[PDB]
């Protein structure tokens, strides 16, 4: 590809970047602020296993 | 005659249903037994019939609205959504007579580009948008800052996210193949013979015989085959849309049409509902554009050339001299010559191009037969941001919108929709049609069936082509009825277009037979 | 075939005047078209339909067509009263917006968005016999107080602010107000192209030569025979088809509470509940046999090129020569003949339906990246109805706000059934050489493709070519002696001239008594 096109793309990425590297945390760690939150957090752990 | 127009057939009526206690009406309907095709007569647009009734019984009042009632629409809206500075009714009732309107969204805010398309239901069996089912202009407050580049948007209440997850996949495959083969011979025969006698004795006798023969044969054969395959495709993705899972605000029109559905099951009304709004709505979609180019070239040349020659000579002279003299010269010949030359040149080309999303300028220039300039592909992909197609869709059936929050007898309506939808999938299938010729695909189009004729085919049945023979792909006939319960089963004869004829193409899809629990 | 003869257009006598319609003060009567002028000949100056002023001697008792609904003075449009003083003139009278003291009666702040351009053609009726737009069926300008808008995905339009150097897209026309009758108007940019190209070229050559010579001499005798044949055959065939279909809209017309055009509304109320063929015929002739309820908005281009060349050349010669010598005598004789025939025929049709006279002409002349791009740009501004579905004009009645109308609807159905087999193009005579018969009003044409000339396309610059048959008109219905009736039609108008296609449909038709 052209030097111009690559350059311009690499510029535009600064404004529409995507996630390319991530470190994950399990989703059940967010089960919070709800009735039976502590129980739902375990059932979501088990459901992720399933 | 080759073609024979087949007129629409539709069943005798159902019974009249019992009078609907809410609608104070009764209903009757018919099934499309046979779509019209090949310029057949179309049936009257009266597969539904309706009657009024005496109110043999009352019914439940329309579901209580705890909120404010929008005068014209009757949209039940929350009292916090009055004097809001927004129209939440589709009507000014909410804002009508407000002593003070507290503008929340004071800034300049755009709607998400094409977001209102996604509020349209789709007919999944056609994959085609229908009437609006969801109101994506209802904001219910909101006014969180959402930006794309420098442009800030106001998200609909219904939409969970609309986010510019940009991506692009190009794919280019070019395959060129050549073969030539050449064959010649040259072959020659010549024969010459002489025999003569000359003697003295007085007496004298002489004889001479002359023989010449030539034979020549030549043969030439040539074959040249030249084949080009060129498939190019661009998949561009520009935004990810997801609908909220819960508490959707329906469009007025869909709301009302639902409100008018009969409580007793009668297929005709749910059929009309699907024909207005379709069967499913879009929960999650990937928005972007497609470009796809596919060229096929076959160049086949053959030459055959033959030469045959025969030559024959005979002369005989016999002379007897003793005065006395007698002589005879006797000579004869035949020549034979044959030349035979046969040449054929055949070129078959087809191209198909396909584009979705973007501006008409770019769409059409990409629809020309030449592969595009990178510049015009840039311009097209720029313009797809603003007018994208829907590449990926995840859909839920429309009955999942029918919710007690909105409708009396919600469960009953829901179940009716399930039943109706199941019948609708049968009645709208393309399987019903008579087969096209010419490898045509019958597309059922309401009460009549259209053959989409391929590239290089023409006419109502695709019967016109200059290609003598081309592979015909197999097409299923309609799946059988449900087998009576001892287990449940269906079968498909793969018959409606025979897969084998004319160098028959692909066999039909699997399964040929489908079985289930009752 | 020699030219057919002109016929004079011929009409039946006037039907009697209808009794003077109390609300209208009009008498009506119709003729029926007994013969169009066909292959030239005197057109009728008489019209098929006539109307005259007449005082009825009786009041318009029916004038109270509506009660609680607001009825406009000029016109029977009856509006749901929230529309009165709603800020939008919902009838041509404008009386619904007249004397409105309460300005806050306005329904909504919608008017900044103008109606969808090109939405009006979806309103117009359609005449399947002539493929011509009629008068409006739908009210293309009616919103019902609603403010449904449509996102115009092509809204981008470059603007350059000289004072700033900013190069930007003007926001104008980002949305359009959707008229009430449109259920949907899905902007959706699609294109599909299809090309095929097939070349078949074959050339064959033969030569065959015989010599047969005998000499026998002492008195001298000498006999020679020659037979030679040469025969050349060449056939060259090129066919290429280009179909590029561009789409920008899908629109669908509401099946419920269709707000008829005011003119249609009036014209409809004027129809008698009793059958009167002339009245309904006039109605159909005005509003068209058919009205439309599905649409795509597009540009289309189609290119077809067919070239056939064939050359055949033959030489034959024979000689036999004979000799008797010793005085000398010589003889000979035989047969020789020579012929060449060649022909080439080529034609192209290039047609564009789409958004600019200049560029659609250019692209009809010249296919290229330049004409495709500039025509595509032009399709931004003047897209065209590229496909549509339609229903018989009478089926709207079921779907109107008015109610049953079932007397009118059945009358209109009968009238249509007649009209489609009175003004039918089949009744114009045989157009030869794949000419298309057209019946406009009381008069016929044959539209001739360029190979043909003359009133019937009958004379052709070449002497004979494959041209297809077409149906005669249906005969009259039989008497139905049983509960069943018959009708008969023959593929003889014209017969297939040179073994073109026999016309495909039914030869025989049958009907419930
Ligand atoms: C058959 O004979 C012809 C005539 O000699 C051959 O073609 C010639 O080949 C020579 C040498 O390659 C060339 O110089 C001539 O110009 C050719 N003349 C023509 C008319 O082709 C041919 O190659 C021979 N074929 C075989 C199979 O022997």
Curated annotation (Swiss-Prot), chain A:
Coiled coil: none
Location in the cell: Secreted; Target cell membrane
PTM info: C-, N- and O-glycosylated. O-glycosylated with core 1 or possibly core 8 glycans.
Disease linked to the protein: Complement component 7 deficiency: A rare defect of the complement classical pathway associated with susceptibility to severe recurrent infections, predominantly by Neisseria gonorrhoeae or Neisseria meningitidis.
Family to which this protein belongs: Belongs to the complement C6/C7/C8/C9 family.
Binding partners and assembly: Monomer or dimer; as a C5b-7 complex it can also form multimeric rosettes. Component of the membrane attack complex (MAC), composed of complement C5b, C6, C7, C8A, C8B, C8G and multiple copies of the pore-forming subunit C9.
Role, per record: Component of the membrane attack complex (MAC), a multiprotein complex activated by the complement cascade, which inserts into a target cell membrane and forms a pore, leading to target cell membrane rupture and cell lysis. The MAC is initiated by proteolytic cleavage of C5 into complement C5b in response to the classical, alternative, lectin and GZMK complement pathways. The complement pathways consist in a cascade of proteins that leads to phagocytosis and breakdown of pathogens and signaling that strengthens the adaptive immune system. C7 serves as a membrane anchor.
Protein name: Complement component C7
Residues of the full protein shown: 398 to 447 of 843
Curated annotation (Swiss-Prot), chain B:
Region Disordered: start-end pairs: 496-518
Key words of the record: Complement alternate pathway, Complement pathway, Cytolysis, Disulfide bond, EGF-like domain, Glycoprotein, Immunity, Innate immunity, Membrane, Membrane attack complex, Phosphoprotein, Repeat, Secreted, Signal, Target cell membrane, Target membrane, Transmembrane, Transmembrane beta strand
Cell compartments where the protein resides: Secreted; Target cell membrane
InterPro entries: C8A_B_C6_EGF-like, LDL_receptor-like_sf, LDLR_class-A_CS, LDrepeatLR_classA_rpt, MAC_perforin, MACPF, MACPF_CS, TSP1_rpt
Pfam families: EGF_C8A_B_C6, Ldl_recept_a, MACPF, TSP_1
SS bond partners: 8-43, 19-53, 22-59, 65-76, 70-89, 83-98, 105-143, 315-331, 431-478, 433-449, 436-451, 453-462, 485-518
Subunit note: Heterotrimer of 3 chains: alpha (C8A), beta (C8B) and gamma (C8G); the alpha and gamma chains are disulfide bonded. Component of the membrane attack complex (MAC), composed of complement C5b, C6, C7, C8A, C8B, C8G and multiple copies of the pore-forming subunit C9.
PANTHER family reported for this sequence: COMPLEMENT COMPONENT C6, COMPLEMENT COMPONENT C8 BETA CHAIN
Name listed for the protein in its UniProt record: Complement component C8 beta chain
Source organism per UniProt: Homo sapiens
Curated annotation (Swiss-Prot), chain C:
Presence of the UniProt keyword Translocase in the record: no
Domain EGF-like: 428-458
InterPro entries per record: C8A_B_C6_EGF-like (IPR048831), Growth_fac_rcpt_cys_sf (IPR009030), LDL_receptor-like_sf (IPR036055), LDLR_class-A_CS (IPR023415), LDrepeatLR_classA_rpt (IPR002172), MAC_perforin (IPR001862), MACPF (IPR020864), MACPF_CS (IPR020863)
Disulfide bonds: 9-44, 20-54, 23-60, 66-78, 72-91, 85-100, 110-147, 325-328, 426-473, 428-444, 431-446, 448-457, 480-513, 491-503
Domain LDL-receptor class A: 64-102
Glycosylation sites: 14, 366, 471, 474, 477
Membrane topology: Multi-pass membrane protein
Principal localisation: secreted
Span of domain TSP type-1: 8-61, 468-512
Site entry (Not glycosylated), positions: 13
PROSITE patterns in alphabetical order: EGF_1 (PS00022), LDLRA_1 (PS01209), LDLRA_2 (PS50068), MACPF_1 (PS00279), MACPF_2 (PS51412), TSP1 (PS50092)
Residue ranges constituting the MACPF domain according to the UniProt record: 105-427
GO cellular component, one term: membrane attack complex
Compartments reported by the entry: Secreted; Target cell membrane
Subunit-level organization: Heterotrimer of 3 chains: alpha (C8A), beta (C8B) and gamma (C8G); the alpha and gamma chains are disulfide bonded. Component of the membrane attack complex (MAC), composed of complement C5b, C6, C7, C8A, C8B, C8G and multiple copies of the pore-forming subunit C9.
PANTHER family xref list: COMPLEMENT COMPONENT C6 (PTHR45742), COMPLEMENT COMPONENT C8 ALPHA CHAIN (PTHR45742:SF1)
Protein name, UniProt field: Complement component C8 alpha chain
């Amino acid at each position: 590809g052209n030097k111009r096109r690559y350059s311009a793309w690499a510029e535009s990425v600064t404004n529409l970047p995507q996630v390319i590297k991530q470190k994950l945390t399990p989703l059940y760690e967010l089960v919070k602020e709800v009735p039976c939150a502590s129980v739902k957090k375990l059932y979501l752990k088990w459901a992720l296993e399933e | 005659v080759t073609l024979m127009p087949i007129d629409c057939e539709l069943s005798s009526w159902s019974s009249w249903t019992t009078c609907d206690p809410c609608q104070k009406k009764r209903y009757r309907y018919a099934y499309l037994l046979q779509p019209s095709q090949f310029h057949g007569e179309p049936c009257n647009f009266s597969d539904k019939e309706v009657e009024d009734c005496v109110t043999n019984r009352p019914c439940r009042s329309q579901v209580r609205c705890e909120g404010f009632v929008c005068a014209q629409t009757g949209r039940c809206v929350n009292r916090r959504l009055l004097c809001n500075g927004d129209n939440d009714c589709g009507d000014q009732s909410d804002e009508a007579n407000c002593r003070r309107i507290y503008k929340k969204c004071q800034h300049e805010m755009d709607q998400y580009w094409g977001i209102g398309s996604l509020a349209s239901g789709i007919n999944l069996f056609t994959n085609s948008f229908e009437g609006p089912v969801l109101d994506h202009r209802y904001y219910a407050g909101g006014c969180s800052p959402h930006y794309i580049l420098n442009t800030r948007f106001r998200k609909p209440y219904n939409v969970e996210s609309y986010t510019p997850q940009t991506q692009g996949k190009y794919e280019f495959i070019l395959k060129e193949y050549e073969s030539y083969s050449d064959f010649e011979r040259n072959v020659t025969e010549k024969m010459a013979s002489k025999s003569g006698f000359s003697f003295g004795f007085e007496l004298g006798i002489s004889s001479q015989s002359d023989r010449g023969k030539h034979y020549i044969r030549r043969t030439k054969r040539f074959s040249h085959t030249k084949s080009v395959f060129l498939h190019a495709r661009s998949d561009l993705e520009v935004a990810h849309y997801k609908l909220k899972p819960r508490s959707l605000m329906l469009h007025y029109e869909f709301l009302q049409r639902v409100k008018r559905l009969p409580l007793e099951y009668s297929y005709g009304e749910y059929r009309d509902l699907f024909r207005d709004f379709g069967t499913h709505y879009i929960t999650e979609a990937v928005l972007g554009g497609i470009y796809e180019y596919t060229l096929v070239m076959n160049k086949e040349a053959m030459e055959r050339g033959d030469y045959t020659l025969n030559n024959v000579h005979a002369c005989a002279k016999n002379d007897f001299k003793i005065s006395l003299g007698v002589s005879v010269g006797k000579c004869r010949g035949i020549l034979n010559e044959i030349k035979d030359r046969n040449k054929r040149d055949t070129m078959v080309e087809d191209l198909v191009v396909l584009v979705r999303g973007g501006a008409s300028e770019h769409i059409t220039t990409l629809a020309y037969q030449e592969l595009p300039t990178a510049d015009l592909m840039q311009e097209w992909g720029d313009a797809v941001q603003y007018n994208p197609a829907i590449i990926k869709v995840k859909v839920e059936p429309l009955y999942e919108l029918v919710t007690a929050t909105d409708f009396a007898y919600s469960s009953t309506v829901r179940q009716n929709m399930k039943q109706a939808l199941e019948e609708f999938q049968k009645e709208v299938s393309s399987c019903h049609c008579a087969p096209c010729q010419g490898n045509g695909v019958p597309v059922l189009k309401g009460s009549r069936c259209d053959c989409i004729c391929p590239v290089g085919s023409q006419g109502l049945a695709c019967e016109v082509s200059y290609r003598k023979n081309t592979p015909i792909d197999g097409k299923w006939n309609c799946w059988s009825n449900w087998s009576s319960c001892s287990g449940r089963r269906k079968t498909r004869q793969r018959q409606c277009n025979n897969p084998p004829p004319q160098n028959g193409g692909s066999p039909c899809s699997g399964p040929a037979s489908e079985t289930l629990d009752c | 075939a020699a030219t057919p003869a002109a016929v004079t257009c011929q009409l039946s006598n006037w039907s009697e005047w209808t009794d003077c319609f109390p609300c209208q003060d009009k008498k009506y009567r119709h003729r029926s078209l007994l013969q169009p002028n066909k292959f030239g000949g005197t057109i009728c100056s008489g019209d098929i339909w006539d109307q005259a002023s007449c005082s009825s001697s009786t009041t318009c008792v029916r004038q109270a067509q509506c009660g609680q609904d607001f009825q406009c003075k000029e016109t029977g449009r009856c509006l749901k009263r929230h529309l009165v003083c709603n800020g939008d003139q919902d009838c041509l009278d404008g009386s619904d917006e007249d004397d409105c003291e309460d300005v806050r009666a306005i329904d909504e702040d919608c008017s900044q968005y103008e109606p969808i351009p090109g939405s009006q053609k979806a309103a117009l009726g359609y005449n399947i016999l002539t493929q011509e737009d009629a008068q409006s069926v739908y009210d293309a300008s009616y919103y019902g107080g609603q403010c449904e808008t449509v996102y115009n995905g092509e809204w981008r339009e470059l603007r350059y602010d000289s004072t700033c150097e900013r190069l930007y897209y003007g926001d104008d026309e980002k949305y359009f107000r959707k008229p009430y009758n449109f259920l949907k108007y899905h902007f959706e940019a699609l294109a599909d192209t299809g090309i095929s190209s097939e070349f078949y070229d074959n050339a064959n050559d033969l030569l065959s030569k015989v010599k047969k010579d005998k000499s026998d001499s002492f008195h001298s005798q000498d006999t020679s025979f020659l037979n030679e044949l040469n025969k050349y055959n060449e056939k060259k065939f090129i066919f290429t088809r280009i179909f590029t279909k561009v789409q920008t809209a899908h629109f669908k017309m509401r099946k419920d509470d269709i707000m008829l055009d005011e003119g249609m509304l009036q014209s409809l109320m004027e129809l008698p509940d009793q059958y009167n063929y002339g009245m309904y015929a006039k109605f159909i002739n005005d509003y068209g046999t058919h009205y439309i309820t599905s649409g795509s908005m597009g540009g289309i281009y189609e290119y077809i090129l067919v070239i056939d060349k064939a050359k055949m050349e033959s030489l034959g010669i024979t000689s036999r020569d004979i000799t008797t010598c010793f005085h000398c005598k010589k003889f000979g004789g035989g047969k020789t003949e020579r012929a060449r025939k060649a022909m080439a025929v080529e034609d192209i049709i290039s047609r564009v339906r789409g958004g600019s006279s200049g560029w659609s002409g250019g692209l009809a002349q010249n296919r290229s990246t330049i004409t495709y791009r500039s025509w595509g740009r032009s399709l931004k501004y003047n897209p065209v109805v590229i496909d549509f579905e339609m229903q018989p004009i009478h089926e709207v009645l079921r779907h109107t706000s008015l109610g049953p109308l079932e007397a009118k609807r059945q009358n209109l159905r009968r009238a249509l059934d007649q009209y489609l087999m009175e003004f039918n193009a089949c009744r114009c005579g045989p157009c030869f050489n794949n000419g298309v018969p057209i019946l406009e009003g009381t008069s016929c044409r044959c539209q001739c493709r360029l190979g043909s000339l003359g009133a019937a396309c009958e004379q052709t610059q070449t002497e004979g070519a494959k041209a297809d048959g077409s149906w005669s008109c249906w005969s009259s219905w039989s008497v139905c002696r049983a509960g069943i009736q018959e009708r008969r039609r023959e593929c003889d108008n014209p017969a297939p001239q040179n073994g073109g296609a026999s016309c495909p449909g039914r030869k025989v038709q049958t009907q419930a008594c």
